[PDB]
């Protein structure tokens, strides 16, 4: 059967075009601040009275977390054509579309930020350092240098609270001061801190993710004491979460917590379970006295909903035919090499037979999760007639500290076996007639890792924005990613070499498709050029697609088409062979 | 917003549109036509409006039938993409019933004529001229090279041969005794041949400057110019003779060419024909019929002199209106010589509008008024197409072809650049893009280096990046061509890999992954140099990359069109 290219393009472009919204906070006069992919690009909008107002001109990457009622929004715009060197732009909410560049900040990798209306506190990674900056009337000030990736969580008064990846894959809590600066790190011996919000008593309420569970703890920044937080309702404690998505104090003092287990989240106010649509939820805001959150699911693109009715305020609509191309989704537990149960989401295509063509779609990160959340790539594969298997290999989030840290020191090892077991499960369970592997960033590294370490398991592979050589990538990384590479490999350069797919090209026996941004910082192109030379010299058949002016974060419809369409075409072509 | 799916939908139809060629008249006054679509070839009978398929499985070609014979000889590949073929006979009264001609072993069938009594064909295994009759197969002569049967009248067989010397020779043979008589044209090259009722050989003699209609006496090899009753043909001043043949009533039909377009002549008198290029001419039910193609018209069967299509592939109302009209312009170049340039205008672009200079490869080739899927796809996507016959092109005299010798991406680049400046000066181009494949891709890269600012973006396909590297890396034949094409000093200066610093516009690379004539290793070096110098570029490397199928278009054409569509924002 011939590949139906034109339908694939039409399906792919419609799935990319559907509006996707992100909830950021409440500004001005009870205006919802939302980030949305609408009209083919990423923009920032004010929502109020059933209408949206565009705040930015040219597409953005994100905005900083606003304090309630501040009369401005701080845009974050990549000004390096995908290299993730960002700049900050202020937009007065009273004059949307009028941007003022914050010229006191030089282009750096902006990692997080909070705007109190009086000061703009953020974390940025330059070539030599990750630091916690503050921008006010007295100029730009560095408050502290951070030993790796750090993100601002909350600011109440003079106290700043955040989260830091400062060692061995565990997340530490940190505090600083707007007036005096400095840094104080809070490490937990039970697990990692997940979210953080400063209480009215100037404490730090934080989520603590231990080996197999998660709970709320109170951290006194004065002496570092930690105690379990008790809530006036017991719904949260009996919910027994394994991960905490986000928490924060509402302006009326109530504590909102979004926690999750088995790829689905729940909303709690002062411990009480609030009804929310099935799936995954973002931050919770108080808007005109009502609770608003974001909602997403494997069949529902990210949307803005009110609680507890679950009724949408902003959502993109999918055409019925695309809705039908996803027959359903389920979570199954795949047994891996050492007897661990790998939580795996399966997306059953309504346009494939059973057994039928199946793509194992490996998520990136690796500190990320295949959850019941919208995946544009997974939707395109179901629309093109592929079942999608999404394994949360070890190193994934959402299933406890123990499962997440198992990857530390073992890239392309135990987690690769998890991917293989899910693939073998698909065929052995009667779901898959043939097996393909596909992934981007770290998922693209896994594809190369799979085709080199386990030839013959899959029929063909798609590696997008992949890691090819840990050594060269480390030499081409900034302060943050160099530290991140060190934690992932456990400091071992021997792990950096033996676990690099570039050093195992001889083993490849399957057709390979390479897709790569031309000027991405996280995953540089120069090692990929070396990989293609290796493939050619060793007589391996491959195809490569290098997309320019795009990096890790795509914020236009055209670039998203150009990095996804080659993958679907390649797999559809392979299916007829 | 770029409508990627609208571009792909249009490309599918331009690839899938049924194209027709005219083979002759068979059985009871019925046209024999060949239909080609998506690399699939079929043979049909046309009489009344409905077409009757003659074959069961797709074929490779058919042999040339004599007027009115009651059968067709099909040529079909013995395997998938195998150069060796088999012969199948089909009675025109029982279509769909194929009888394999088992007396002919599988071989490379080169040409053939069916008289209704004997099947005479050339085939390569040696290369020989064969005859198949009731008594079986006979080898009439062994040919010193690739040869092709042109015509049979009585026992006299006439054909054309690549028998050495660089020129095409005329040869005769006998259907009874066999044998081989070769006629060298000296300063000339035969292009077509038909045997006159008086058993002389009328042939087209293409030369350096102007083509000649000559008579060859097969008895003594005397060559003399043929003067026709009407003088329209001589005054037409053709540079090539596409095809000629005697109609059943003894009149001589001639299709000749000049400046990328052809004209139809009957005993020297010109017949009105739709603008473009034409195939063979037949007399069918007292009317003249031929095939017609142009930059705006896929190959089709038309009636003369009205030009009314008898058989043409369908194109939707939108796509048809998007591909709107072609013209020939004479672009004044840098040296005073005029560059013959064809222009295909888009109905989806304004004037001035986005315009792509589509550089042909070879370089010994020609941009004529013929159907081109690339140009049509560009026009369908909202681009005017400018196709210049830069020095080195064929079809405009030996002097113009030889002027490129010793000046790679030098003199001929100016002709391409002059064509781009012409598109601007004449008010057609609002923004300029350059695009080419094989040698045309080499032109694109060298143009972006030596003429930055001229074009807004470039697409380079199957290009040559470094002649110095190419010469030693390539085989004898290609290396010999490189020597005549480019002094090693010129080889390095004309190689665009050494001028990557000068590139200033986005560049799209489309390259085969496993091509011996265009290796991938040099292009990987170019991509490394582009990245090290901060040059914006897009790259598409596809294994096993002539657009016959949609699959071919997806690999080689869609990335170019997608790139240009987003480059215009
Ligand atoms: C290819 O065919 C060549 C032709 O018969 C001689 O012009």
Residue numbers in the entry:
A (entry chain A): 5 to 581
B (entry chain B): 6 to 130, 133 to 493, 496 to 554, 557 to 580
What does the published report state?
Acylpeptide hydrolase (APEH) or acylaminoacyl‐peptidase (AAP) is a serine hydrolase that regulates protein metabolism. It can also bind to and process unusual substrates, acting as a detoxifier. The most prominent physiological function of APEH is the removal of N‐acetylated amino acids from the N‐terminus of oligopeptides and proteins (Perrier et al., 2005) thereby exerting crucial control over the proteasomal degradation of damaged and misfolded proteins (Adibekian et al., 2011; Hoernstein et al., 2023; Hwang et al., 2010; Palmieri et al., 2011; Sandomenico et al., 2021; Shimizu et al., 2003; Shimizu et al., 2004; Tangri et al., 2021). The S9 serine protease subfamily, the so‐called oligopeptidases, employs a further, size‐based selection process (Kobayashi & Smith, 1987).
To further probe the catalytic significance of the shift of the oxyanion loop, we produced PhAPEH and ApAPEH. We found that the archaeal variants are quite selective toward their specific substrate Ac‐Leu‐pNA, not being able to cleave Ac‐Ala‐pNA, while pAPEH processes both almost instantaneously. Furthermore, neither ApAPEH nor PhAPEH is inhibited by meropenem, the bulky carbapenem antibiotic that is a potent inhibitor of pAPEH (Kiss‐Szemán, Stráner, et al., 2022). Attempts at producing a co‐crystal structure of ApAPEH and meropenem were also unsuccessful—using the same protocol that afforded co‐crystals of ApAPEH with peptide‐like chloromethyl ketone inhibitor (Menyhárd et al., 2015; see Data S1, Chapter II: “Substrate/inhibitor preference of APEH from Aeropyrum pernix and Pyrococcus horikoshii”). However, no such shift is caused by the binding of CMK‐derivatives by the archaeal variants of the enzyme. In fact, both the size and the invariability of the active site of ApAPEH (or ApAAP) and PhAPEH (or PhAAP) are closer to those of the “regular” serine hydrolases than to those of pAPEH. Here, we established that this same Pro is also the most likely inducer of the backward shift and flexibility of the oxyanion‐loop, and also demonstrated that archaeal variants that carry Val at this position do not show the same promiscuity (Chapter II: Substrate/inhibitor preference of APEH from Aeropyrum pernix and Pyrococcus horikoshii).
